[PDB]
């Protein structure tokens, strides 16, 4: 009963998210567990209930780990990360509002993505025509230039 629970929850990405949040907050050791005792302690802190306690009742998402930082949201990277984890938890728990909070945070994350995309620019540069200070449009392409008929025939029509 506990083995299936452990293999189902330890491979849940929600468990890894809550575990890394706890590691950031310092509630669990920064390293992966090396003994069964500290693995059980990590499960207790991350899930919020012991594996035996979970098998008794039905609620799962209510006791998942919450940040101790209390990051007043209303420098930027930490706020974005903590708000993202809080919204992930609220989505799992089916919070009352969620959707409006999700839209607001998606706008803020769009702004932060704008800043990050600014950090990712390597410079462009355009080759300019010296005569016209714009993108160079000079080419060696073919021009029709209808020719006089003397280039193909002589005065005798040959």
């Amino acid at each position: 009963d506990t083995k299936v629970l452990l293999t189902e929850i330890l491979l849940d990405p929600m468990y890894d998210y809550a575990a890394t949040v706890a590691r950031i907050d310092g509630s669990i050791p920064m390293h992966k567990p090396r003994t069964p005792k500290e693995a059980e302690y990590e499960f207790k802190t991350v899930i919020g209930r012991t594996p035996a306690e979970l098998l008794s009742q039905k609620e799962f998402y209510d006791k998942i780990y919450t940040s101790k930082y209390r990051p007043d949201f209303t420098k930027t990277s930490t706020l974005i990360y903590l708000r993202a984890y809080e919204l992930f938890l609220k989505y799992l728990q089916n919070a009352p509002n969620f959707n409006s909070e999700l839209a607001e945070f998606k706008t803020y994350e769009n702004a932060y993505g704008e800043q990050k995309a600014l950090l990712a620019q390597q410079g462009f540069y355009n080759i300019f025509d010296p005569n016209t200070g714009r993108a160079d449009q000079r080419t060696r392409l073919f021009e029709y230039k209808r020719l006089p008929i003397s280039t193909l025939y002589d005065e005798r029509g040959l």
Binding site: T20, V21, I24, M30, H31, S77, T78, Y81, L82
Partner: protein, 359 residues
Amino acid sequence: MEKIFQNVEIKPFLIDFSNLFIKNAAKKLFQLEEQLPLVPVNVVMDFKGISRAAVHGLSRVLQDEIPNYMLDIKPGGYKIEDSTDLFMTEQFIRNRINFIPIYAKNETLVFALRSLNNSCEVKTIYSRDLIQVAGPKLKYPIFNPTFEIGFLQPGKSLIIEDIYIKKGIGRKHAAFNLAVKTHFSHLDIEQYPTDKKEYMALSGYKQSSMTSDPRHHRLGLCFPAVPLPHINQAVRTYLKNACRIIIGRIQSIQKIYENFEEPQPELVLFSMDEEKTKAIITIKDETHTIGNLLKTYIYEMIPDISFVGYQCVPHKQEMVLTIIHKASQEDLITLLEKSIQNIIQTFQILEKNVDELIA
């Protein structure tokens, strides 16, 4: 003699802090307002009265045939139990650490990397985070502290405990490469104006390489990390060590020559038809440096040679030098020993000139 290694120019590569962007970035990244403890140094050397083979062999040795030091991770140094980061793999960090240029005098130094990201931001790991755990305390750093080893995701850690100093040569692993090529030119061969359309497809020299024998050369080599105060000493040590390496490698094949009468697997002698004697010298793990030097000096010592040549085939990993001469085995051996002595004399003169030119 007569100072074969003529004047040498030494020019370190320094950060121009007059640039506002560079100054601000350095100040707010590393609190750096002065030059780094280790800087690259550009060494331009003029050589007169010396074959192109010797100068290029010195360049090749300084590039990837001189012993050099690297930072390396011992097996099990990467702590799998403690390295929670999923992107900073052992291969990636090992590649970054292997190629950090280090100027180390003591090989017993051991460093450790204990970077723990207990924040919500991605944390960059710098070489300044490489703390020494073994060996004498470094009075001067052996590497610059501005290298980005890697980055840690929030809540992730990277633990490496056995970063030690490894010795090797560049031709085996490139992290032992010492000098990068900066300039090479012959000052005794006239050059065309290559900015014109008539000469832009040619090399520029006014003599064909198939007929020219330059004896005046300018060699430019850059060393990646030498201490800022002791630049001249580092360059002098590098040049001397290259000369010693060449001399020792030449003496290694000279020792084969002294036992031509005793059966040696490396040296084989024949007497084919017309009083000619053929000598074949096969050296395993020998490069083009020794083969080219040997061929050049044998050909100089025996201008009337029937045939001299070598092949460093990329497979079979060996150098096979073939000498054919209208002589006997004894006289051929004396001539080859004389050529070896000429090579040794030339490189000892180079060592002396290095000593008396870079103070």
